[PDB]
């Protein structure tokens, strides 16, 4: 039976979209079904912020960030903890998991 | 029909305006309510206060027709209109239900809180949906203080007013109790303002009750 | 409204649609193809005589463990050979 009225794809009116490859397993998966996670992080983590600050010319050098949109597979997404199985009445909710920190 | 003594007296309309009953309905609207009038450019629809007062007097007429006082049961789950309900049940011989309304309080006959009334008054349909469903299951009228955004399912005569301010709910309960008492005849004539005060039905935060006690115990 | 036409002048397609659908049944298909006369051991025949060729017993299925006493008979009307069942308890010896 229909486990998902949206069929998971989130297409509803296109017929075909261009597939994208998985970052981990390189699975040719449609760009809308594939789970996209925007990893924006610090090029140097808090483990070395003090060290870099002390040992860098250009006082108050604003260190750069690194941005990458990761196109996960879906088997990979289940396995790499990116996305989790949910209750059948909980699958309804599409809002992200409530702002991890404020 | 009703004698012209039951028209919107100037002081009562002044009180209704002061408590900001009209000022806020919603930035949205549901077509179950043609109680709206002149949607304000601030996107906050105005409520026709005359219609609200007509609804109030109609609800008072419905309540006064009940032969035995304590089959009028008044519900309030949300904080803003808790105290007022209690105060209402103090003056009119009604039965209050404040805070949590235990489910099965109308259908289940084995609960020690099982009340079988002939009328239910609800401070907000969206918050007291459980009371409304319970009234549905046992053929009970629901006089709900509906706003221009609250749902009107299983809701009989609906006083249109505000639900996002304590002033509006407190004064609405005041007017309802006052007109019920006038209809019954305990209050002799319906012109004197019934000296007790609208602020008696207003909400009281525990923080401000502590502050008031501290100001009272300073001397 | 429904799949079938409804107009007052649509008798033709209704009739031919029913006539094409009737082949979906098994009884109607057997009756019209007349497979009973051509293929079955008897052509529309309730009974038929035959000659006993040999005297066999056939094992039953899983849930039932026994050997039912049968008999191979060649039909005389056309020459086909079919196995048949000797019904009752001590009737196998009766038929030689």
């Amino acid at each position: 039976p229909k486990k998902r009225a949206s069929n998971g794809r989130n297409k509803k009116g296109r017929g075909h979209v261009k597939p994208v490859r998985c970052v981990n397993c390189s699975r040719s998966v449609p760009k809308d079904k594939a789970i996209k996670r925007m990893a924006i992080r610090n090029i140097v983590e808090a483990a070395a912020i003090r060290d870099l600050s002390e040992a860098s010319v250009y006082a108050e050098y604003a260190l750069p960030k690194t941005y990458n949109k990761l196109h996960y597979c879906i088997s990979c997404a289940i396995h790499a903890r990116i996305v989790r199985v949910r209750s059948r009445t909980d699958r309804r909710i599409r809002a992200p998991p409530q702002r991890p920190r404020f | 029909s009703l004698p012209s003594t039951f028209d919107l007296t100037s002081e009562d309309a002044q009180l209704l305006l002061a408590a900001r009953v009209h000022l806020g309905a919603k930035n949205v609207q549901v077509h179950q309510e043609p109680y709206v009038y002149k949607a304000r450019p601030d996107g906050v629809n105005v409520i026709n206060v005359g219609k609200t007062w007509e609804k109030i007097v109609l609800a008072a007429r419905i309540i006064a027709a009940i032969p035995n006082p304590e089959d009028v049961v008044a519900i309030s789950s949300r904080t803003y209109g808790q105290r007022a309900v209690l105060k209402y049940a103090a003056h009119t011989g009604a039965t209050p239900i404040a805070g949590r309304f235990t489910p099965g309080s109308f259908t289940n006959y084995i609960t020690r809180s099982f009340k079988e009334p002939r009328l239910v008054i609800v401070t907000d349909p969206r918050s007291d949906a459980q009371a409304i469903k319970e009234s549905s299951y046992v053929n009970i009228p629901v006089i709900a203080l509906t706003d221009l955004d609250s749902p009107s399912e299983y809701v009989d005569v609906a006083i249109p007013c505000n639900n996002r301010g304590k002033h509006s709910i407190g004064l609405i309960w005041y007017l309802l109790a006052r007109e019920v008492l006038r209809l019954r005849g305990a209050l002799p004539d319906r012109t004197q303002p019934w000296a007790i005060m609208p602020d008696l039905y207003f909400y009281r935060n525990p923080e401000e009750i502590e502050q008031q006690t501290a100001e009272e115990e300073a001397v | 409204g429904k799949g079938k036409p409804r107009g007052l002048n649509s008798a033709r397609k209704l009739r031919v649609h029913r006539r094409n659908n009737r082949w979906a049944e098994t009884t109607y298909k057997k009756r019209l193809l007349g497979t009973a006369f051509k293929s079955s051991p008897f052509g529309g025949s309730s009974h038929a005589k035959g000659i006993v060729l040999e005297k066999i017993g056939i094992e039953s299925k899983q849930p039932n463990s026994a050997i039912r006493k049968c008999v191979r008979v060649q039909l005389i009307k056309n020459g086909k050979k079919v196995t048949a069942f000797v019904p009752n308890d001590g009737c196998l010896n009766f038929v030689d």
Partner: protein, 220 residues
Amino acid sequence: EEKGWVPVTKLGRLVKAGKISSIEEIFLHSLPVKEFQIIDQLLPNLKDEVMNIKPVQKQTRAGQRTRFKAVVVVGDSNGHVGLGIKTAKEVAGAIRAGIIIAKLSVIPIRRGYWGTNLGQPHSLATKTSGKCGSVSVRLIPAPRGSGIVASPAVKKLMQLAGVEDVYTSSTGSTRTLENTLKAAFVAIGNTYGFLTPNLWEVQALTPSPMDVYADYATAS
């Protein structure tokens, strides 16, 4: 036998005081009945018949925990029926609670005439129908003395109703007795849900019995 029946409902209190005389007052104002003793008081001669006892099992880690579903039909053969369906551990308790529910769920029916009216109504008033699960039951009026043309369970339901002549037609998996009896119950209770030309004039809305006699309730 031993029966006190302290009334816990205002309707029960009024009935015990003897203030409601006929069950028509209960049915008219759509009053909610929660005490089976009210129905016992109003209809002294409610016969029954256990339509079916069905073993229903739940698969737990240890064995199969089995209960019994009783399908009881209660009525007086004079235009009053009720259909209780209960599940319980012991079969006798299942039947007791089933008749108990059936008495709680009594309902009135509108017997009519197939053709011209000569004596008391012998059949239903109009065609009616109900549907529970996939079972849809269609009750159709029949001429006088035509019997009850229905399956044995539905036939017993009509006999408990008082309908003497009626045609029936059932579609679906009418095998399942609870679904068939529930569909027939829906139809026969829908018989009073059909507006008919002889039922067009408006009435005066006589005040509710618990409004005029509210004082005798509310045990003080």
